[PDB]
Amino acid sequence: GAPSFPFSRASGPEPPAEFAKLRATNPVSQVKLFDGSLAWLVTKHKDVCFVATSEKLSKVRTRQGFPELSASGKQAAKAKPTFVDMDPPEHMHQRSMVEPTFTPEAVKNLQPYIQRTVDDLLEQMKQKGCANGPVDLVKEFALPVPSYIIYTLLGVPFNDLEYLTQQNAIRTNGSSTAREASAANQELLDYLAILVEQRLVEPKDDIISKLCTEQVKPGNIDKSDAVQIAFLLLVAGNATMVNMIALGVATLAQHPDQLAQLKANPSLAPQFVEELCRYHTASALAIKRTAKEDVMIGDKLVRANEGIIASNQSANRDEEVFENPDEFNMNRKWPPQDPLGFGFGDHRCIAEHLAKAELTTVFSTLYQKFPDLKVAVPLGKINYTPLNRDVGIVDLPVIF
Ligand code: HEM
């Protein structure tokens, strides 16, 4: 029978072993989801791009055969959708309401603020020190950098950042009870609703205010929609950002020649970030569709109302695109084809430029501030996310 999916990672920092075998012998195959239903799994870079762009495929989760991967996903699919789950024309109708903050030009103009945020958190880490033992690079740095930035862009005032960063972390922490995670989720929604009310009365220079002035007041969306769009922008990428920062530090510890390169030349940070986003595809479960009509993919017929999962993680290890794909090599010569860490097509991560700027700022600054930063536990004992989840690191003891 069809194997259960998601697959488990082969070890803490490695992709599932199944993908390499599937790319070689069965690149479009059926898998069994948590509820016993079947879905198609696509593993080659070319086919992942096809799935991401075909207008014969839908992200609408109320369609028959949509590949929800858990009971919580089936429950979430009942809610009113935001643009992440929309097809044209609704998708860009709503996404364009918030895209301006995320353009290359806007993200370039944000660079001094990104740098200040990273610098301030590094200085707080220095002042706290590690004189009594290792400290957790996740809690002290990888968590607040993306959290403070997206909260600030949305419109949260500075004094509220630390508490709301902690609450949003509780939401997804693997140690939280269900009650604890649900209470933190509702606290974030309650806070955002009050912020939307405030910005309807007195808008400021932030994303929520722009939604209020330009879409809520004119009746293009309502205020509960504005809350949900803001919430999507917070929760869609934050855990992935935290994991990418921590994975970057661990990857450099595992590759000491490349770390020494980066310590000696911070202008290598962009190249490092490109290879990191290919090699550790920390969001690998989001390119999902159902077929609106029959569609042929490779040697398979995907029938109408059948589900599809396109693994951008597998695509990023596709030997036919990336030479020596399972080596981390920030000095590689890149091919014509895009790495797919941020997806592809109309739904490609709205925050791709922001995320790369955050990551480039982190890795061009971290080892200037802390040239002796070391992972404090043996690398084989790093606390990775559980193997049946997206790759990530829960906590990362360091000294400096
Ligand atoms: C290194 C960090 C990140 C990675 C690797 C990442 C990756 C991804 C991927 C793989 C997708 C799916 C794209 C597709 O459907 O083809 C996506 C979509 C999305 N991401 Fe991210 N992301 C990151 C950071 C962020 C951040 C910081 C935000 C918000 C500020 C964000 C918000 C979103 C949203 C809203 C979508 C849905 C876009 C749409 O369907 O139109 N992501 N991201």
DSSP labels for 302-345?
E-TT-EEEE-HHHHTT-TTTSSSTTS--TTPPP-SSPP-TT--S
Pocket, ligand 1, Cβ cutoff 6 A:
52, 83-84, 95, 146, 150, 232-233, 236-237, 240-241, 244, 277, 282-283, 286-287, 312, 341-345, 347-351, 354-355
Nearest ligand 1 atom to the CA of 343 is 16
- Residue 138 phi/psi, 5-degree rounding, is -70, -60
Task: Categorise residue 311: left if φ over 0, alpha if ψ from -120 to 50, beta otherwise.
Answer: beta
Q: Which of 148, 172, 364 is nearest to 273 (CA)?
A: 364
Residue with tokens 């791709």, as numbered in its chain: 352
In contact, 249 and 264? CB cutoff 8 Å: no
DSSP 205: S
Is-cis flag, bond preceding 134, omega within 30?
no
Contact at 8 Å (CB) between 375 and 398?
Answer: yes
Q: Tell me the CB-side half-sphere exposure of residue 245, using CA atoms within 13 A.
A: 33
**Of ligand 1's atoms, which has the minimum distance to the CA of residue 345?**
16
Query: How far away, in angstroms, is 243 Cα from ligand 1 center?
Result: 13
Buried-state track 230-242, b at ≥16 Cβ within 10 A, e below 16: bbbbbebbbbbbb
Instruction: Quote the ligand 1 centre to 241 CA distance (angstroms).
Output: 10
Which residue, chain included where needed, has tokens 């014969």? 56
In this structure, what is the dihedral angle of CA atoms 65, 66, 72, 76, given to the nearest 10 degrees?
Answer: -120
Q: How far apart are CA 51 and CA 47, in angstroms?
A: 6
Residue 246, both tokens: 């921590």
Residue whose CA is at the smallest distance from ligand 1 atom 19: 349
Residue nearest atom 16 of ligand 1, based on CA coordinates: 343
- Look at strands 38-42 and 57-58 and give their pairing: unpaired
Give how far the C-alpha of residue 364 lies from the chain's centroid of Cα atoms, to the nearest Å. 20
339 alpha carbon – ligand 1 mean position (Å): 14
- According to DSSP, the β-strands at 38-42 and 28-32 are antiparallel
Binding-site residue set: 349
Report the atom number in ligand 1 closest to the C-alpha of 283.
Answer: 10
- Torsion 222-228-233-234 (CA) sign: positive
Final resolution, Å: 1.5
Do residues 340 and 315 lie in contact, with contact meaning Cβ atoms separated by under 8 Å?
Answer: yes
| Residue 124 neighbours by CB under 8 Å, 6+ apart | 140
> Which residues are within 8 A (CB) of 317 and not within 5 positions of it... i.e. 6 or more apart?
15, 19, 20, 23, 325, 326
Helices and strands, number each (H, E), in the chain: 16, 12
**CATH fit for domain 1-400, picks 3.40.50.300, 1.10.630.10, 3.40.50.150, 3.50.20.10:** 1.10.630.10
User: Strand, coil or helix: what is 16?
Assistant: coil
Give the angle 286-287-292 at the CA atoms, nearest 5°. Answer: 125
Residue 324: DSSP 8-state: S
Do residues 366 and 97 make contact, with C-beta atoms less than 8 angstroms apart? Answer: no
Pairs from 154-158 (Cβ < 8 Å, separation ≥ 24): 154/192, 154/195, 154/206, 154/207, 154/208, 154/230, 154/233, 154/234, 155/195, 155/199, 155/204, 155/206, 155/207, 155/208, 155/209, 156/195
| Residue 110 Cα to ligand 1 middle (Å) | 18
In angstroms, the first-to-last Cα distance of the chain is 51
Instruction: Name the residue with the closest Cα to ligand 1, atom 37.
Output: 84
89 upstream amide cis, omega within 30 of 0: yes
- Give the span between the Cα atoms of 251 and 276, in whole angstroms: 8
Catalytic residues: 240, 283, 349, 390
Distance CA 357, CA 334 (A): 19
Strand, coil or helix: what is 8?
Answer: coil
Q: Write the burial class of residue 396 (CB in 10 Å: 0-12 exposed, 13-18 middle, 19+ buried).
A: buried
Here the tokens at position 267 are 């202008």
State how far the Cα of 131 lies from the Cα of 368, in Å rounded to an integer: 20
Q: What is the number of other CB atoms lying within 10 angstroms of the CB of residue 185?
A: 17
Which tokens is 21 given?
């075998």
Fill in the DSSP letter of residue 54. -
Q: Whose CA is nearest to atom 42 of ligand 1?
A: 237
In degrees to the nearest 10, what's the CA dihedral of 276, 327, 364, 283? 10
Pairwise CA distance, residues 213 & 283, whole Å: 33
Are 210 and 199 in contact by the 8 Å Cβ rule? The answer is no
DSSP letter (8 states) at residue 80? P
Q: Which residues are annotated as a binding site for heme?
A: 349
237 Cα to the center of ligand 1, angstroms: 6
Atom 43, ligand 1: residue with shortest CA distance: 349
Q: What six digits make up the tokens of 316?
A: 């990023």
Distance from the alpha carbon of residue 99 to the mean position of ligand 1, in angstroms: 12
Q: Tokens 């029978």 identify what position?
A: 1
CA of 150, closest atom in ligand 1: 30
E strand spans, the chain: 28-32, 38-42, 57-58, 135-136, 288-291, 295-297, 300-302, 307-310, 374-375, 383-384, 393-395, 397-399
CB distance 311 to 284 below 8 Å: yes
Ligand 1, atom nearest to 233 Cα: 29
Count of CB atoms within 10 A of residue 129's CB? 10
Distances (CA, A) of 377 to 247, 252, 253, 255, 394: 14, 14, 11, 16, 13
Q: How far apart are CA 256 and CA 81, in angstroms?
A: 45
Residue nearest to atom 6 of ligand 1 (CA): 342
Q: Give, in order, the Cα–Cα distances in Å from 338 to each of 77, 181, 267, 277, 279.
A: 30, 36, 22, 11, 13
Strand partners, 291: 57
Query: Would you say the C-alpha torsion 167, 117, 240, 141 has a positive or negative sign?
Result: negative
CA of 105 to the centre of ligand 1 (A): 18
For a pocket test of ligand 1, which of 278, 342, 360 has the largest count of ligand atoms closer than 8 A to its C-beta? 342
How many other β-carbons are positioned within 10 Å of the β-carbon of residue 138?
A: 23
CA-nearest residue for atom 20, ligand 1, is: 349
Buried b (16+ CB within 10 A) or exposed e, 349-367: bbbbbbbbbbbbbbbbbbb
**Which residues have a C–N gap over 2.5 Å right after them in the chain?**
none
Beta bridge partners of 334: none
Length of the chain: 400
Report the relative pairing of strands 307-310 and 38-42 from DSSP bridges.
parallel
141 token code pair: 């740095």
List of E strands, 15-121: 28-32, 38-42, 57-58
Q: Which helix (H) or strand (E) segment is 243 a member of? A: helix 223-254
